[PDB]
């Protein structure tokens, strides 16, 4: 379907919801993708081994995306398999919800270090690993929570709204080497609330993954910093 | 090859820049394109033998947009013609660019006229005749104007940033029989500051067609409200 | 309370409501308020006594602010009474809520002229008189609606999406004389129980609430802001 | 010049600058002023004296606001000695610009712990202190980086869109005993083509629309985003 200059796809957190969507959708539109798993290869291995099934190109590769020396690691061992990298996705995140009365700050540490910080080394990693082939487009996986805030989601708010500005300024520093940067914001999606969304349901991890793939096809070679909406009309 | 459930599109002012691009590019993707113009038939018939020529399906029609009978009417031949319309762009539009106190009442008239009131009544139709069939998709051609304002363009800043609040009425009317409505907000297409644009070089046409077809393919299915940044960097 | 460089400021439909309450607000600061009306004099006008009874400057005058030769000449005679006029607020607004397959263009052309076209004219006309003088402000009261839409009204949020952005064009050509622009998007206000469960301050806004937020934009304390639109909506829309 | 219903507030990195004249502000409209500074005494001192031979209440205190248990051992020594606290800002901030290739992770730890999680604990202790009361108001002083990002800039804009975004959700949890949170973002101020007002924003300026979000006239304005700007993003 899309077309794409590009090759490949490093996808963080792939291994399940949202982040296996993406790899299902992108794998079915002819890109090798690697998807990035922390803890349990069973789940991801039987992914990539679904994907294999249907004709499509897929790796797994083991890493936390927080930690620096491992994303750079990470990226490095692509290299050598497929000579560069074209795309990333930025998926991995985690959400620890209280109150901020009751919130201490190891737990907003906690957010921003696997939500903020490990999209600041993949940006700036993707940044260095693109500039050499002067192309590339990469995708930040915000929420709607970053544009709109929550209640008992101080830290991961803060951590998604840094997400979607952070993207805006990398935007810029990729703009003359041909690396675009975009945020996808999501609604609430399926893997009372449904009252106040428009559409009137819950958007599919797919509805999702199409987004971040029109981002990353040639389509949208003119659009870089932004951030599109995929939430049903629930914010415009 | 984008996916698209619908079959066919309407596209005011198609005959030439932006509007030809929309034709060609989702004539290329299977869908029939109405390509409405108001004067000059020659060129509209131009660009539908041509369209022809790739083995397209392709039509023209003439009316003017900001006219309500003239539109209601063109519809209705459509309807007639293709059994329904699924999808609809308010592409019409015109600049009469002036300093504000060098600015009549009637120059503001003109540029709301065709710019707004064209779209109120496009989308108030695509909602009528759409809502049938319980699915379709309109996209609202807008501007950076619309969003950032400018100097000497009053009446176009009105005119598309009413195009764009509008577009977010319609997507709530529209939501419960699967109508989706957005907008696109193109920033400087080729048809100097330059400098201020980060990806350093004007939009093509192409670029502006292709985010319009994301936003009226199968693939934007949960996207409705929004509006989409084409600018390259310039608003971000 | 607040400081103001300007002596004077004109109000459209001030008689009541919103109006009423920046013409109240504006003249409790030290300002002579213009109050216009289209209509219904005796409402103007005991709203003028009320003010001149606290020790205030208060006027009113008639015009229709969509029509653009009685805006033209009511400003002259403001200018002739006051010899210029160093604020504006655009309120004269109108709703004609019905959904959109149901609305005539008629129906659409009456809210853009009273709440567009209206707010077109009064920042053209305040353009003109204020750039002599080089120092203005002006305040366009828009609404929630504008920024983010609403089912049934197509036509309002059409119109109040637009003096927002058309705001915006006005606030770059006033700049270099320094006249600001800006707007207030106010959600819903008292002049309710389904509204009230969204909105997070848990009550509707009063009128006083936006007047003070209009006065703000107005006051010179707002003096490096322009362009901008301020929500005044108790959190419904962030 | 306006009217406030609390009696106090409290200013982080308040010594120069911004902060400085914030606290010249409010202290000039009658609110005891709290200027929080992390190092340099002689600063803070300075300007409180000022503040007190032009007849206002004044105090400094001494704190690193990233620093969880120093913030609310501040906190308490305020509430000792005025009986609560109704009003915060949070402008503590700083820079370290790069390019991103060239930037460490700890330059962009630095300026996140400095600039957002600094605003976090300041609004978490507010919320805290003014639920009591139920009354209150706070203000993030965030930045047009915030919104629009810039170049060399990836940790600056992510600490300050974060700021942003996380005072929206500090509304919703405010909203019910009525303590406001709301951001300004400033642009270019000073210690100009692309400007249309043409010049650089005075600290004035800016401390002017802090103190309007603190006032009682911006009662029914919370988890808004004041630009302060002079036309520069729109
Ligand atoms: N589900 C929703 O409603 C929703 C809404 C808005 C945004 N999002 C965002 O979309 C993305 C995916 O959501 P999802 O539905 O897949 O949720 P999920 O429950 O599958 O969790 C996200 C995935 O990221 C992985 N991950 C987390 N931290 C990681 C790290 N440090 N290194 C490597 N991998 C890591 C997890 O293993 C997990 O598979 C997230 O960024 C999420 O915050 C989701
Ligand atoms: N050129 C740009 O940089 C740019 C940027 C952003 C948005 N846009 C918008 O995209 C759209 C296309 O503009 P373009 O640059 O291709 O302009 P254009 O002048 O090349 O073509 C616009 C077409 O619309 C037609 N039109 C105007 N009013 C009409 C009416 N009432 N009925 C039928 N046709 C009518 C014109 O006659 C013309 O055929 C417009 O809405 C424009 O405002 C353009
Ligand atoms: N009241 C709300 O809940 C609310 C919410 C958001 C925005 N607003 C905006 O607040 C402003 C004031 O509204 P309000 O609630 O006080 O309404 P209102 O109807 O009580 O007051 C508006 C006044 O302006 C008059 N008016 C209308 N068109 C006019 C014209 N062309 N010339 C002169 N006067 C005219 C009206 O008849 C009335 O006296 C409006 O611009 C409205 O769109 C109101
Ligand atoms: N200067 C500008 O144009 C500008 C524009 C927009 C926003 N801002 C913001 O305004 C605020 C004030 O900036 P300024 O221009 O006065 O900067 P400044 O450096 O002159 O003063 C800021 C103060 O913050 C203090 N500070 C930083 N981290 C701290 C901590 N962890 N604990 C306690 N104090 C701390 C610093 O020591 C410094 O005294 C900042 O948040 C900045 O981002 C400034
Ligand atoms: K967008
Ligand atoms: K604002």
Chains 1, 2 share one sequence.
């Not at 999501?186 to 797919?206: H, Q």
């Amino acid at each position: 379907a899309m077309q794409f200059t590009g090759k490949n796809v490093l996808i963080t957190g792939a291994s399940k919801g949202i982040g296996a969507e993406i790899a299902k959708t992108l794998a079915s539109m002819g890109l090798k993708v690697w998807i990035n798993y922390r803890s349990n290869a069973e789940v991801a291995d039987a992914l990539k081994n679904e994907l294999e099934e249907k004709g499509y190109k897929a790796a797994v590769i083991k890493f936390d995306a927080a930690s620096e020396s491992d994303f750079i690691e990470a990226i490095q061992t692509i290299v050598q398999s497929d000579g560069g990298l074209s795309y990333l996705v930025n998926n991995a995140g985690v959400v620890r919800d209280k109150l901020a009365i009751k919130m201490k700050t190891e737990d907003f540490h906690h957010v921003i270090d696997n939500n903020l910080t490990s999209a600041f080394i993949g940006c700036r990693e993707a940044l260095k690993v693109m500039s050499k082939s002067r192309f590339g487009s990469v995708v930040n996986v915000a929420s709607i929570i970053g544009e709109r805030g929550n209640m008992g989601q101080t830290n991961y708010s803060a951590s998604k709204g840094g997400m979607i500005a952070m993207s805006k300024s990398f935007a810029y520093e990729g703009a003359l080497r041909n690396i675009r940067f975009n945020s996808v914001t999501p609604g609430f999606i399926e893997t009372d609330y449904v009252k106040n969304i428009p559409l009137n349901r819950l958007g599919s991890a797919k509805e999702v993954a199409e987004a971040v793939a029109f981002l990353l096809s040639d389509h949208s070679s003119y659009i870089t910093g932004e951030t599109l909406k995929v939430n049903g009309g629930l914010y415009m």
